[PDB]
Each structure stands twice: as C-alpha cells, then as structure tokens.
Amino acid sequence: VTQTMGLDIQKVAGTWYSLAMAASDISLLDAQSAPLRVYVEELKPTPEGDLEILLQKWCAQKKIIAEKTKIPAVFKIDAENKVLVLDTDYKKYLLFCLENSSLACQCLVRTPEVDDEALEKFDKALKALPMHIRLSFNPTQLEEC
Template identity: 60%
Template sequence: MKCLVLALSVALVCGTQAIFVPRTVPEDLDVQKVAGTWHSMAMAASDISLLNTERAPLRVFVKELRPTPENNLEIVLQRWEDGSCAEKKILAEKTEVPAEFKISYLDENKLHVLDTDYENYMFLCMENAAAPGQGLACQYLARTLTADEGVMEQFHTALKPLPVHIWLRFTPTQAEGDPWAPRQGGSASECPGRWEWGSPLSARSPRKQWEVGVQSR
C-alpha cells in the first residue's frame, strides 16, 4: 500500500526562507523494505550549479540501498570523477524524525524520504540545512529502468512547494535498454545513460527528450 511518508514544504521564518519537514502520517518508514536495486529516473535541484554538468556536485546516480540492522541506510551512488564513473557509499543515519536521516556528503547533511510504495518508486531529497532553499536536490527512484509517467506527475506535484527550479530526466540510450551496461567501445566504469534538461512531464512529447527546464517561481 502506497505510503506517503513525508511532504516537504517551504516557510518564511524571520524573513529567511527555510525548509521544514512536517510529519503527515503516523506510519514510520520501514527501512528494511527499501533494500535492493534502484535507478535514478529524474532529478531536481534548487540551483543549476548542483546539476548542470556531468561532474556537478549532486548529479549522482543511486544504484542500491542497503539497510543496516540498526535501521540506518547505506546508499550506493555513482558519479563522474576524473573522467570515469566512481562508486561512492553514503551512510544515512536514522534520526528521531521518521524518514529523515543524517548524512555527510559534500555540503548536504540531511536526507528526507518524501514518498515510497517500496515496490516501484521512491522520492527522496538531500538538503544542506545550513543554507535552506539553496542546497536542495531531489530524485525520483524506480525499481526498473522504465519511468512511470503517473509517478513522474506525482513527483512533480510533490516538489511544487519546494524551491526547486532545475530538472533532469533520464533517457535510456542503450540498444538493449540497459544504461548501466558498458557503452560500445567504452568501459564498465561509465555512468548510466543520457540525461537531458526539461520539465519532468516533457516525456509526453514525441521526442521524449528534455529541453532546458528552468522553472520560474
């Protein structure tokens, strides 16, 4: 059963934009159920510099989630470094707030799980709490390599209250449809597929590609 774990919203506190995470339902996230392979389907961020190049700091590809016996979460990521795709591991430590984890990755120090049905999709965000509204990046993760357009709309709706303006969507380019496989003439250390700019709903267009997606607020 689909479980809306958290919704992020934006508030003005003492004239400064701050992000807070209200608990919307009494049910806690079952960390053990999120174990296994995931694929990054879409990304959104509060600042273009977080995603605009292959080596942008938060342009990372989630590969696997590994719960620990303590209900912490090990996140296996891939990202471009020094001309190849390097694997990274982040430990997300549980907090007293359901579906909120403490992390240490670049300037990001919080990870929020917005929504998941465990079997098909998950929405999560990484936040720099020291710079509210400036260091926020979110992803739609799927269990398969095919994005569900209904879930994509749901992701778009979930992020509407947030200060995210830059969007990227994944477009598989492999002949076999597996973007994680080595490209022709390439090595197994390449990051997956092709990412293009645009609205997360632009896949409805015949080209199924993204155009520059800077959202005005």
C-alpha cells in the first residue's frame, strides 16, 4: 500500500456512501454477512484527531473508533487493526483500505450519486493490490445495507 493520502481529518467530517469495495480474500466480502461487507454512513473526527466511523452491517449500526497514529493517513482500529486513507478531495470521494498486521478497500462518496471519477481513482489504486473480489453499488442500494 504505497499511495497514502497531508490528510486533514477534520475536512472528511459528514455522511458518506460506500460506492465500491474490494478485498484480497473472497471470504471477506462475498456473503451479505461477510466480515468486511460494511457500508460507511458517517465519519466523525474528534477534537483529539481520532476518527469515529458509523457504518451498517447485515441491518445493525456499528460505531468504530479509529485512533490517530504518528502517520496522518493511518488510524489504529480496535477490531483488522489499520485504516489507511489512500486519497480524498474532501468534497466528493475518499478511498481507504483496512488491513491486519486481510486487505479490504472502499470507495466513498459524499452523495448517493453514481460517480465514475471516484470509481476511476478507486480502480487505479487497486491495480498495485492483490484483489480477488470487487463490488460496486447503484444509487438505489446507496440509499437502502
């Protein structure tokens, strides 16, 4: 994972939609109930510079605390143990991966609009990475787990 994001975590605050996901292992995403089949709902940065992720899993709310590390784009999550922010323009899309020590990556959009720019940057970032499954969602699914 060579492309990490001068991230300013405060400017990623608000609602996001999981437009696409990918994973190194089919078992991570393939089932509705698969461990990393998680739909982001909101990023809530804390004043301390930590990141709360709100997300939905098959249809339960979960609240993940991602702790700041000495690296701006890299967060420790208390269960997977790293969030990496690969890229964001803040206003439209954010690309992140989850890894252990297991690689799963998501393309997030601010609005439930189909966004080919977001998917184009996601598909570029995945070339270097050993993905064996890739899902993309429609705007109906964006607004619906």
